[PDB]
Amino acid sequence: MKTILSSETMDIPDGVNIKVKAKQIEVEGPRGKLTRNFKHLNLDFQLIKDEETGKKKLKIDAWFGSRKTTAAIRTALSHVENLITGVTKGYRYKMRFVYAHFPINASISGGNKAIEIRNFLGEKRVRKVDMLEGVTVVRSEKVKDELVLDGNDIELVSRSAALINQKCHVKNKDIRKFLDGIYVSEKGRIV
RNA sequence: UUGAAAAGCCAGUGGCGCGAAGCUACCGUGCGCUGGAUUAUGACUGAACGCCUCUAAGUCAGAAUCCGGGCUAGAAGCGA
Ligand SMILES: [K+]
């Protein structure tokens, strides 16, 4: 029914710099740089500075927006929160190898930017996966048959994990019985 | 049949054997191709709906599929 004003605000930690211009959000922190293009959202983004204190707030609002349009405000705020988390703490995904008979042989290429899977269900084919930008994959030493993906972009890290998982799908078998694969087991922050 | 020999000719290709050349047969030989976008499907982050959610915004992989490329032709189209 076109609610007049739907607004939501988020606090910004003092250790992160943020710039907004034409719905282009630039985030800077100790771990590096992140960028997002929110041009596809018909929302108004504003950065409020507290002169007396010096703190930062990001306010996103929609005017005369329907429910569908208003649903994007929280999405944008969560995306900005994820950017801040990635630039301050970073993102770490953990994957575990699951197999019944054939151990999965994983080889990490140079730079921790590519992975080779060789013995999935005793298959002679070699599966190649390349990590996305800013995401590095390593083989854990404290946990058996575990892969650690570290990055600054939650979306890129999760997409790399999804690529690894989907590259090892079982076919022509009852997947309920043949549970072999590589699956995401934990999501968290590097620090 | 030309007197004979030799050498020819007629029987509309006289008949038979071999027969080069050309043509020709899976009856012989050579060759027949790879970038993008996507369907179904499976997923990422993510609200709506403080949780959840492949979906609402955004995003990924994806086919004897489509498009392009390659091959054939080359327009009251054109260049040096
Ligand atoms: K989800």
Side-chain angles (χ1 to χ4, degrees):
Chain A
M1 67 103 181
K2 307 302 185 70
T3 288
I4 278 162
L5 164 60
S6 318
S7 154
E8 265 140 17
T9 299
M10 57 170 298
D11 274 300
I12 295 148
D14 53 6
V16 187
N17 288 301
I18 196 183
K19 292 137 81 292
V20 194
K21 210 202 136 59
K23 294 175 290 185
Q24 195 93 33
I25 281 69
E26 223 293 289
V27 173
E28 178 94 331
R31 292 188 49 81
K33 219 163 251 301
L34 283 166
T35 278
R36 193 103 190 216
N37 198 210
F38 282 123
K39 204 103 67 166
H40 58 90
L41 303 177
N42 223 230
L43 305 165
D44 179 55
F45 295 68
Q46 216 198 108
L47 213 82
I48 275 78
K49 198 87 38 202
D50 292 345
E51 290 183 357
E52 288 190 350
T53 64
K55 274 310 325 313
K56 272 160 288 149
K57 326 190 160 65
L58 172 63
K59 170 150 81 58
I60 299 169
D61 70 14
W63 295 94
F64 295 106
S66 52
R67 285 177 89 259
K68 186 163 92 56
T69 279
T70 301
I73 295 163
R74 171 58 40 189
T75 302
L77 282 179
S78 287
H79 286 329
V80 173
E81 271 136 52
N82 282 345
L83 260 52
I84 288 166
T85 301
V87 81
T88 64
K89 322 185 142 55
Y91 283 98
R92 170 167 288 161
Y93 275 41
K94 306 242 189 146
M95 312 190 74
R96 297 292 305 282
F97 304 157
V98 184
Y99 54 81
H101 186 260
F102 300 108
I104 292 164
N105 263 82
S107 159
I108 306 297
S109 193
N112 297 298
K113 289 286 277 199
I115 184 158
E116 259 155 14
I117 294 100
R118 272 189 171 75
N119 200 41
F120 183 67
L121 276 164
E123 221 148 275
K124 287 193 152 166
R125 170 161 89 85
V126 189
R127 288 152 163 79
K128 269 293 292 174
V129 181
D130 303 306
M131 282 323 93
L132 300 176
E133 322 93 85
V135 181
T136 75
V137 57
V138 302
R139 181 70 172 276
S140 149
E141 289 144 329
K142 12 184 170 161
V143 178
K144 168 172 170 262
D145 281 312
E146 169 164 272
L147 291 177
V148 178
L149 289 84
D150 279 2
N152 280 357
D153 205 301
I154 183 174
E155 253 146 32
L156 300 177
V157 171
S158 58
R159 232 206 292 155
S160 277
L163 290 166
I164 295 169
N165 159 260
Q166 294 213 316
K167 189 58 68 75
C168 306
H169 279 336
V170 184
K171 290 163 189 304
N172 301 122
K173 302 279 169 303
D174 195 340
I175 60 160
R176 305 170 310 161
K177 169 62 155 300
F178 291 79
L179 302 162
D180 297 37
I182 316 186
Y183 308 91
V184 171
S185 83
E186 141 166 13
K187 308 156 193 168
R189 284 74 156 296
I190 293 164
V191 317

